[PDB]
């Protein structure tokens, strides 16, 4: 009763839906299944499959400290190279530990430069089609080769005691960022409060200026921002840890972007295995893992510095050649599904899902998807809970402004496993319902998945 | 025969279409007319109507030089204020002329600062939902309060005679930008040519670094880029013209962002009348005119510094209250339709078109739209030409990656004027047809508009 369920959805919402028994050639439900749609985070299903095929479940991201030169009386005669490898999980502590190791190896002094090597990747750290306005939010932090603590930092914004005085920014001293406040404090219920925005404006070298207005508050406003220049940020952390460890240097911090022969690895850190990271990515919808993986795929397949375009070409090739899926006129712009350039039909995603199901005993893939009523994004998906399908749906959510997708598998009343793709976009509510916007979605899903479960 | 014409379109393309006699309550063609879609540049139809209602056809953008202080023996004892007003047509020459006027007024020296006043607007000069990657292209130049020559500048990129040497940037000395090249010159058919990108990276104060690779060429590559900091850019031009005119100052160039009482206007420039600018906007799809107008509407309606959110609220209010159109769950994010956040149903745009037709003798609006086979965007729209409808269609195009819209009016074989909205999105061709992508569109439109013209 797809058309009737659509009446639950806001005026003009667009649904493309396909449901199909695993291993069957014909769908049980086909509503606009050929129509292109924004996949949002369902794109991560494709990223996870292509990653497992190209890189394998045991791949690990790697970061190293390398020396190029002889060490004489504790003095490295040459450069220290910190070779970043797009590990989305690298932490300040890992840098501290690698420096401790460098020290313990006998290096007290560097007679040369400290090089921040990001040559594993090239071109922009932002995919085409990402909205500019989200770039300072942590969920959209540029997934660069140099990442430390997700390239996200927090700040506290304090209103001034006196109205008209600048609001005050508190930030932990260890973060190599520079914060400036041009935020005017307003009276508690002021005229300017309506249309005066509070904005973050990023500048070079990880400078941030906050601008606009802040109404007086009793509590500081917590804010978290994305680092725009990961290489500089990682360099500054490395510089700090070297100094704390008592290692001096005569040169400067420089970026190294061009491919080069590795020196002697003196310290290293490897991530958890790729399967573990893909699990986090799928359960929690982790954009940074998705997009580091995505540019890694292109780098590994074509033996070139990883770019968005190489990633896209690689994923298309892997799907066609290894998974037997010709994605045709599909557009793949990134790994996370953040890009508004991604375009894919339910029928194409269905072929991907059918491949995964057929090879699930090899891939151990379905266990990584959120299980309705248990974990990840579907721990409490109201429509699925109310449909009676908790524990019966393993699926990836995909949400962006105007988009509420689901793609995955459902075990129905007969015990039949069905792959399904729900692509719902053009979703908008009227201004007076914007912070209550999800109730129509719940109504729709409660009905559809009860229908699918009961009748199959 | 809408469904059959759709077979001309690429796999999975999404059409929402409505055609309706002017003044009629029921549509002649209704194919998904209630469904939300990306309007692209058809949004400019709404912007033009709301602008004429709020500002009127005779509104002019204004830029001034103002003095605050007494002038003693040719010395201004106080500040020079350059008050920008978002005029999208202001030129270097206009600044030169206003400075000439300031000189002629008796000011030889400023004992104070030179203030670049942008207080007419506030918050970001980029609307929510604009893709970040286009921001350095001139068609997406941030439409700031301070614009000079469309905040666009050109550059010539020369490959190095020797492979491996940096490519060279030539730029006219009068442009206050700073260009850096890290572009490596490659052999004419090299290995790196495939996945090594040529990129522009904007920095603070109108710095641009070009990075990546450029294959050797006999001719320099012409490039044009958008200015990211219009206030600094306009300030530098003002500084240059003051110096050339022999006016000295003791202070510095500072930005003035807060609303303030105007000083004595000593020089000014007003744009052409708004109706003339709206005509350019509609004929040529001028994003900068659309978006300066859009933030001006909010500024004029609410008497606040213009923002994107004030513009959106104002346009919704104007449509509902003055045009009798409740846009319901429609999202309006900007004036140009660049934003991927814009969402509107053909039926809503249809109400706008019906209003314009009913009031055309008041507004003189339809004459501003491109006329098929004559001007603007429709001078050679192949599908319309092949449909036999040249001289019979006045309509606004809307194109973005994946989107080919038309909205406007058609005079049919019976002489009946019909309003129509064609919203076609999810348009994608396979990699091997991307630079030939428009042929399916032409096939579709040739058929649809011949059908509409002949049968109505």
Curated annotation (Swiss-Prot), chains A, B:
Cellular compartments per GO CC: periplasmic space; plasma membrane
Biological process (GO), any one: peptidoglycan metabolic process
Region of interest: Absent in class-A beta-lactamases: 69-242
Keyword annotations of the record: Antibiotic resistance, Cell cycle, Cell division, Cell shape, Cell wall biogenesis/degradation, Hydrolase, Peptidoglycan synthesis, Periplasm, Signal
Residues reported in the UniProt entry to bind substrate: 396
Residue ranges of coiled coil: none
Pathway(s) served: Cell wall biogenesis; peptidoglycan biosynthesis
Catalytic machinery residues: 41, 44, 285
A GO molecular-function annotation: serine-type endopeptidase activity
Catalytic activity, reaction form: Preferential cleavage: (Ac)2-L-Lys-D-Ala-|-D-Ala. Also transpeptidation of peptidyl-alanyl moieties that are N-acyl substituents of D-alanine
One protein family per Pfam: Peptidase_S13
InterPro entries: Beta-lactam/transpept-like, Peptidase_S13
Enzyme Commission numbers on file: 3.4.16.4, 3.4.21.-
Principal location class: periplasm
Superkingdom: Bacteria
Subcellular location: Periplasm
NCBIfam families documented for this protein: PBP4, PRK11113.1
Note from the entry: In E.coli there are three murein endopeptidases: two are penicillin sensitive (DacB and PbpG), the other (MepA) not.
Function: Not involved in transpeptidation but exclusively catalyzes a DD-carboxypeptidase and DD-endopeptidase reaction.
Membership in a protein family: Belongs to the peptidase S13 family.
Protein name: D-alanyl-D-alanine carboxypeptidase DacB
Species of origin: Escherichia coli (strain K12)
